[PDB]
Design a protein around this ligand. Structure first.
Ligand SMILES: Nc1ncnc2c1ncn2[C@@H]1O[C@H](COP(=O)(O)OP(=O)(O)OP(=O)(O)O)[C@@H](O)[C@H]1O
Ligand SMILES: Nc1ncnc2c1ncn2[C@@H]1O[C@H](COP(=O)(O)OP(=O)(O)OP(=O)(O)O)[C@@H](O)[C@H]1O
Ligand SMILES: Nc1ncnc2c1ncn2[C@@H]1O[C@H](COP(=O)(O)OP(=O)(O)O)[C@@H](O)[C@H]1O
Ligand SMILES: [Mg+2]
Ligand SMILES: [Mg+2]
Ligand SMILES: [Mg+2]
Lengths: 384, 394, 219, 228
């Protein structure tokens, strides 16, 4: 376990041979070094003798406790599960480093003395807000954008994969990335390919669900959220639809906008706090970019501002080609009549038409998709 | 040449490490304990010595005493209350009232006094650790650096020049301007340079769900503040913690105002904080309450505006000192291109201007690379720019 | 029965209380504003009757309240929301102060700055009897207060507190105190030992706290 | 949140005219020097495009045969005031049969400079240098978006104004000559300018007691460039 971190010749050399031969002699020295201790000091088994001596110290009714202070000379005040706290002492098999206020520990039944500490059963919300797997396909699924994708790899992926380029430059990566445009323009869709691509611990949160009914529960949820993001790894925090904190008012919130405000203040701390931040990236996305506070949008808090335009028609045919790739297209159709049907159709619109047309074929048990499928299909999708 | 001969002679000793280190005893990965090779102090003696003579000594809280006699009045967590006594090992001196004491479970007598409650969420906002921000790095507002630093550290580092002159130094100071101007970044150089308890406070963390709840947190903060001799209390973004009182009709924003009034009381009146210096910083000061803005609480009043030309050039020389560039560029040209601009924007231009050299295959940025930063950051992001309604602070 | 001081907050309201605390050799008792505010219910109420019961025991005793507006907020009718628990404690303040079974043993000194906040039920006639405002010092008192705080400094007789209080209008005792300390620091910056008039003149400039923006284009 | 346009500062002064003090800082830099030999004047163009015609833009424009001006800040607003000055000279000559003096021009524009409001709309984002030769010889003035004006000897106005003033006070004296004053100016111009100096980046005009207001062109100009 972490015996020798050096690998640097990386060849067939007498260097890499003599490494092990040295460490060979040291590990044999450890073997026959400890071998004499039981040869001339049997006196025990030492594999379970001292171990069950510890387990003969500690009783089987192991009560579960929680720290609240520390006095260094192995005694402290520890809170009971009832609440009536004590002033017990602490053992020598307690390996006194994992002791923080509020931690779960192991106590005696009788004198309630601090026997051991307890590993904490994670947290329900960490898994809830924690994204497990890659959602879907890569960046090749998107099509048409091809410029800001270089922007997203630029601020996000390239800092991860090539931390040589910033160092030869004498520079750090940009901090904050924001995404804005018309709705249905693939804003979340790009983040799915990011969540495909990355190996970092990924988090995703809607801007709508920040708001609470309890006072300060929002900002508390923020503080523990950034706690979770920082405590894990090179992490990617995504926020969708952050305008919804400013647009809609809900009567579940006891406070009005002057609690929403305080929520945005605590978040505004967590972007640009004086504390050492660490390796957490921030991707934001919405459609109403003009509405929120520009104080969150200052450089220092967000560096990169990324608009998503409406698709041009030669990109539209590409998006049709993507959403018609694996499907049994009957050759009755022409996609170019389908392009100019709406002047300002989204990429959600194309897939809506395609999938709904597949629903129309599955009404008639068919396998291929004909022209009138699209004819009545856009009647269903667009006009209502 | 000896391809397998290095690999298996490598591998049998990489395994033979573990094959006898299991015969040492590090194994049986636990559920919360310690290394078996370490605990052996409490092995035969303290196992029956720190245990079998040792009591539990349940901790309590004193109500009060009475005259002529000990006849102490104890209090516990949930249960009833007793008339109790000392031990012989302690004097009745430090058995003052309202004090936590360790007390046996049988005779119910006092063993040792205890420190009172600290409420560890307040303990968390002690920083314990310093950032690296140099006064060299906040260059451009050196008069503000001086005018602040003469207030902050000079009595702490020299408590004689104020005394022998015969003046009491001020205690309170706010810092304010538009965002990104170097308020928080400026505070980090103080937390760098300092030595005493630097207890930071962000006001939205005081937003509680119960009533009076943050108000007691204020009190406890000043309790452990008065324990220390000299202590620096930091206040970030105090507009959440209070604008003013404006109440009309149904009581709106009632709860915040009472905590603000407690903050007033802990600052001024009736044998105060003494040697406890405070430091606020806001974005928009215009919202703030006048009695809060009364001196004796917020004496020094430091503005942070944009640098004139030379501070901006200096900020170019701060963020731009450590990047591969063309040697023969000039920054004064760029500062001419950035009239109304913060140093965060300057840094952002530095970091983007590197990325231009990172775009194709260049190692060092050029002047026209900087120009490629200027129009994009300054003029293409000019829809947002966040500043001008904060110049008026609305 | 019941004195109330109100006005601008820099007028010195705490200062009288700690003065009279030195004056009388009686049971002085003080209160914070939000001190009578608890998470649970009725604890502030019991906390009230403990204080008036203890001050009931100490028959020579006066009670001080600072910042009554924390609790003394005027009532309102509203559905769906609206606090009550503070107004409970406000009600035992009203009755337990005055009403059924009165007494003449305690004297009440209250301090606030804003009056319109207050429920007029505590401003009746006899719960709070003598309501006095604290105006701003006219000019001569402004000379007098910086004359007070100018005591523990090396002062060369370069001072004209009449000039100082005339060139300093619209200030309070806190600000006039602050010119004294800031002149006490400017002279330390120039390293001088005694004080001159311009030290005060510049201390005024710092206490006023103007925004510098390049104005030399007048007159 | 929206104040009125006639709102005084808490410092006392204003907001919007004070913002026009900010606005003129973005303009191209300009240098005029009053020498007893005569007043020289120079400005850059801030050349943008190769496809741009360069001579379509200028900052030198004259009012009379002994009065020219130099503008900065905003541009399109200034020509109104230029027209007012020219009209003013033609009134003064029309009724007096003599030339209006340069200072009396300057006050006449400066009275116009602060007249906006909400009766009978906003201030002006320009910065003006006034060259002329009256009976008191060479004259050079500088006015304000506040309408406050002054006589200067060598004033640098624009984006690099304050840096050029420092480099200007060290080199100016009362006994300058015009030929050294021109080259002296163009050195500082070449310093503060972005692009490489040529015969197209800048333009000049001088006024003499002897001859009229004359504007230079790119034939007599580049000799000072090669002989900088
Ligand atoms: N350029 C595109 N290429 C392929 N599919 C697209 C494109 N744009 C949008 N879509 C389809 O539209 C759907 C909606 O994408 P997404 O939700 O990311 O857009 P959005 O702008 O984030 O929507 P919203 O504005 O509702 O958040 C995606 O599942 C995607 O398949
Ligand atoms: N004078 C300066 N020199 C160098 N960098 C600066 C300066 N002022 C601000 N910055 C940059 O601004 C960023 C934010 O600084 P800081 O957090 O202090 O802003 P602020 O003035 O506190 O406003 P806010 O409270 O919104 O953050 C820092 O990353 C720093 O790089
Ligand atoms: N003679 C005086 N008149 C008025 N104020 C004074 C005088 N002497 C000192 N002061 C100032 O008055 C302040 C008293 O605080 P105070 O104004 O009572 O707070 P508040 O009124 O907001 O409770 C002191 O801090 C002191 O600096
Ligand atoms: Mg979406
Ligand atoms: Mg900050
Ligand atoms: Mg007071």
């Amino acid at each position: 376990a972490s015996k020798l971190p050096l690998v640097t010749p990386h060849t067939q050399c007498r260097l890499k041979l003599l490494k092990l031969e040295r460490i060979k002699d040291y590990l044999l020295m450890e073997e026959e070094f400890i071998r004499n201790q039981e040869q001339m000091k049997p006196l025990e088994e030492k594999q379970e003798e001292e171990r069950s001596k510890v387990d003969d110290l500690r009783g089987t009714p192991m009560s579960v406790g929680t720290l609240e202070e520390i006095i260094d000379d192995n005694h402290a005040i520890v809170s009971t599960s009832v609440g009536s706290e004590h002033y017990v002492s602490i053992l020598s098999f307690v390996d006194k480093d994992l002791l923080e206020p509020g931690c779960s520990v192991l106590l005696n039944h009788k004198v309630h003395a601090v026997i051991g500490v307890l590993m904490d059963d994670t947290d329900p919300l960490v898994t809830v807000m924690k994204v497990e797997k890659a959602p879907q396909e890569t960046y090749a699924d998107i099509g048409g954008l091809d410029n800001q994708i270089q922007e997203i790899k630029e601020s996000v992926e390239l800092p991860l994969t090539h931390p040589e380029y910033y160092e030869e430059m004498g520079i750090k990566p940009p901090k904050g990335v924001i995404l804005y445009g018309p709705p249905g323009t693939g804003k979340t869709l790009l983040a799915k390919a990011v969540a495909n691509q990355t190996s970092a611990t990924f988090l995703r949160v809607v801007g709508s669900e920040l708001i609470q009914k309890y006072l300060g529960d929002g900002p508390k949820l923020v503080r523990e959220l950034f706690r979770v993001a920082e405590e894990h790894a090179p992490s990617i925090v995504f926020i969708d639809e952050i305008d919804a904190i400013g647009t809609k008012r809900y009567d579940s919130n006891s406070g009005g906008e002057r609690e929403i405000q305080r929520t945005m203040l605590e978040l505004l701390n967590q972007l640009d706090g004086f504390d050492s931040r660490g390796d957490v990236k921030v991707i934001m996305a919405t459609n109403r970019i003009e509405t929120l506070d520009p104080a969150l949008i200052r450089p220092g808090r967000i560096d990169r501002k990324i608009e998503f335009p409406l698709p041009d028609e030669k990109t539209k045919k590409r998006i049709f080609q993507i959403h018609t790739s694996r499907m049994t297209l009957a050759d009755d159709v022409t996609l170019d009549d389908l392009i100019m049907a709406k002047d300002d159709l989204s990429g959600a619109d194309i897939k809506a038409i395609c999938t709904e047309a597949g629903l129309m074929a599955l009404r008639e048990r068919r396998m291929k998709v004909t022209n009138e499928d699209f004819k009545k299909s856009k009647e269903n999708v667009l006009y209502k | 040449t000896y391809s397998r001969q290095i690999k298996q002679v490598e591998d049998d000793i990489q395994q033979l490490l573990k094959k006898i280190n299991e015969l040492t005893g590090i194994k049986e990965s636990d559920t919360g304990l310690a290394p078996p090779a370490l605990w052996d102090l409490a092995a035969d003696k303290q196992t029956l010595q720190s245990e079998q003579p040792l009591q539990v000594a349940r901790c309590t809280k004193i109500i009060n005493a009475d005259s002529e006699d000990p006849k102490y009045i104890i209090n516990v967590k949930q249960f009833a209350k007793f008339v109790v006594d000392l031990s012989d090992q302690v004097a009745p001196t430090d058995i003052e009232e309202g004090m936590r004491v360790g007390v046996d479970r049988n005779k119910y007598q006092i063993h040792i006094p205890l420190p009172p409650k600290i409420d560890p969420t307040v303990t968390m906002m002690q920083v314990e650790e310093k950032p690296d921000v140099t006064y060299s790095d906040v260059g451009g507002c050196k008069e503000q650096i001086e005018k602040l630093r003469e207030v902050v550290e000079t009595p702490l580092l020299h408590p004689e020049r104020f005394v022998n002159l015969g003046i009491e130094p001020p205690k309170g100071v706010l810092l304010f301007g538009p965002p990104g101007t170097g308020k928080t970044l400026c505070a980090r150089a103080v937390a760098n340079r300092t030595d005493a308890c630097f207890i930071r406070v962000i006001g939205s963390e005081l937003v509680q769900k119960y009533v009076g709840e943050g108000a007691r947190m204020v009190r406890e903060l000043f309790e452990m503040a008065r324990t220390k001799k000299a202590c620096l209390i930091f206040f970030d973004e105090i507009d959440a913690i209070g604008g003013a009182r404006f109440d009309d009709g149904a009581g709106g924003d009632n709860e915040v105002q009472r905590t603000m009034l407690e903050l007033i009381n802990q600052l001024d009146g009736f044998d105060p904080r003494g040697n406890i210096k405070v430091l606020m910083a806001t974005n928009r000061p215009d919202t703030l309450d006048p009695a809060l803005m009364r001196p004796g609480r917020l004496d020094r009043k430091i503005e942070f505006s944009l640098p004139d030309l030379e501070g901006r050039t200096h900020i170019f020389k701060i963020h731009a000192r450590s990047m591969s560039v063309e040697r023969d560029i000039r920054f004064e040209l760029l500062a001419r291109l950035c009239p109304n601009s913060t140093g965060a924007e300057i840094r952002s231009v530095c970091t983007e201007a590197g990325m231009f050299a990172i775009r194709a295959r260049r190692k060092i940025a050029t002047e026209k690379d900087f120009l490629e930063a200027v129009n994009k950051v300054i003029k293409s992001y000019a829809k947002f720019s966040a500043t001008p309604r904060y110049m008026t602070y609305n | 029965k019941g004195v109330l001081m109100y006005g601008p907050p820099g007028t010195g309201k705490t200062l009288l209380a700690r003065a009279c605390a030195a004056q009388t050799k009686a049971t002085f008792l003080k209160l914070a504003g939000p001190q009578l505010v608890q998470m649970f219910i009725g604890d502030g109420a019991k906390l009230v009757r403990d204080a008036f019961a203890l001050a009931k025991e100490k028959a020579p005793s006066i009670i001080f309240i600072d910042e009554l507006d924390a609790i003394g907020t005027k009532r309102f009718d509203s559905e769906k929301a609206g606090d009550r628990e503070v107004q409970r404690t406000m009600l035992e303040l009203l009755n337990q102060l005055d009403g059924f079974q009165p007494n003449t043993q305690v004297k009440v000194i209250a301090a606030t700055n804003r009056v319109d906040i207050l429920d007029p039920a505590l401003l009746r006639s006899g719960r709070l009897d003598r309501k006095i405002e604290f105006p701003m010092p006219n000019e001569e008192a402004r000379a007098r207060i910086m004359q007070i705080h100018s005591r523990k400094m090396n002062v060369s007789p370069d001072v004209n507190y009449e000039e100082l209080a005339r060139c300093t209008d619209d200030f309070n005792g806190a600000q006039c105190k602050a010119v004294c300390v800031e002149a006490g620091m400017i002279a330390l910056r120039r390293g001088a030992t005694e004080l001159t008039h311009e030290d005060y003149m510049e201390g005024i400039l710092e206490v006023q706290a103007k925004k510098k923006a390049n104005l030399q284009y007048y007159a | 949140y929206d104040r009125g346009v006639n709102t005084f500062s808490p410092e006392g002064r204003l907001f919007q005219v004070e913002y026009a003090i900010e606005a003129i800082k973005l303009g191209s830099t300009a240098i005029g020097i009053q020498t007893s030999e005569g007043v020289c004047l120079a400005v850059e163009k801030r050349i943008t495009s190769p496809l741009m015609e360069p001579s379509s833009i200028e900052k030198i424009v004259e009012i009379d045969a002994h009065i020219g001006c130099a503008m900065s800040g905003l541009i399109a607003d200034a020509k109104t005031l230029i027209d007012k000055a020219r009209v003013e000279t033609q009134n003064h000559w029309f009724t007096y049969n003599e030339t209006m003096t340069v200072e009396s021009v300057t006050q006449a524009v400066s009275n116009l400079a602060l007249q906006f409001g909400e009766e009978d709309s906003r201030p002006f984002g320009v910065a003006l240098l006034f060259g002329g030769v009256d009976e008191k010889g060479p004259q050079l003035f500088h006015m304000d978006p506040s309408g406050t004006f002054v006589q200067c000897d060598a004033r640098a106005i624009g984006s690099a104004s304050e840096g050029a003033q420092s480099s200007l006070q060290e080199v100016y004296h009362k006994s300058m000559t015009l030929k050294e004053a021109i080259k002296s100016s163009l050195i500082i111009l070449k310093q503060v300018m972005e692009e490489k100096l040529n015969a197209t980046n800048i333009e000049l005009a001088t006024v003499q007691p002897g001859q009229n207001f004359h504007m230079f062109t790119k034939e007599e100009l580049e000799e000072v460039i090669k002989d900088i």
